Amino acid sequence: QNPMRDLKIEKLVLNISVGESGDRLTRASKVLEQLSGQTPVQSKARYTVRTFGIRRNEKIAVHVTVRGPKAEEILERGLKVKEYQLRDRNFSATGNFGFGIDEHIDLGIKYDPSIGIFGMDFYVVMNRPGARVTRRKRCKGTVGNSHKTTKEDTVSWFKQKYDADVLDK
């Protein structure tokens, strides 16, 4: 049986970790909202080091969290730029995954000379239902190990879609 333990996506998220604060961070935010259609959320520091040249609360980053048909469309577009070929070494221990890239305009973007070039960190959260059974206020619970997700079932579903293979290890 497989009534509704069939797999799907929970969310896509897009992160950009700018080296410092400033016009660079504003431009990264502009890129993310131009793609997403929705305003982004900045990200502050945690502590201090000079090797990167940073301090506490210095506005290092930005990200966005998106869902649904738009998310999976962006995902499969990421896959076709990524030539439908990936790594079990890249793949995580849960079935969730992602990849960090350069040349963001490849996703079908009307480039502007101001923004320059920025690399990104895409991440993908797949699941089955019970998402709110863990993330609500009432009757909270930790899901069953059957309903949990894993490397093997997630990659098998992801491979039989597109018939797109990955590497051995």
The helix (H) or strand (E) run that includes residue 145 is none
Residue 139 sits in the site that holds another protein (CB under 8 A): yes
Residue 84 sits in the site that holds RNA (CB under 7 A): no
Residue from 3, 37, 69, 141 that binds another protein (CB under 8 A)? Answer: 141
- Sole residue written with tokens 């619970």: 141
Annotate each residue in 63-82 with x if it binds RNA (CB under 7 A) or - if it does not, as one string: xxxxx---------------
- Sole residue written with tokens 């070039």: 117
What the block records as the tokens of 56 is 């506490």
> How far is the C-alpha of 121 from the C-alpha of 17, rounded, in Å?
8
Site residues (CB under 7 A) for RNA, limited to 14-33: 15-19
Residue from 56, 110, 137, 169 that binds another protein (CB under 8 A)? Answer: 137
The sign of the dihedral angle between the CA atoms of 107, 110, 113, 115 is: negative
> How far is the C-alpha of 79 from the C-alpha of 84, rounded, in Å?
5
Does residue 103 sit in helix, strand or coil?
coil
For the CB of residue 112, give the shortest distance to RNA in the complex, in Å.
18
What the block records as the tokens of 6 is 């069939």
Site residues (CB under 7 A) for RNA, limited to 90-129: 90-94, 96-102, 118-123, 125, 128-129
Residue from 140, 147, 159, 161 that binds another protein (CB under 8 A)? Answer: 140
Residues engaged in binding another protein (CB under 8 A): 137-141
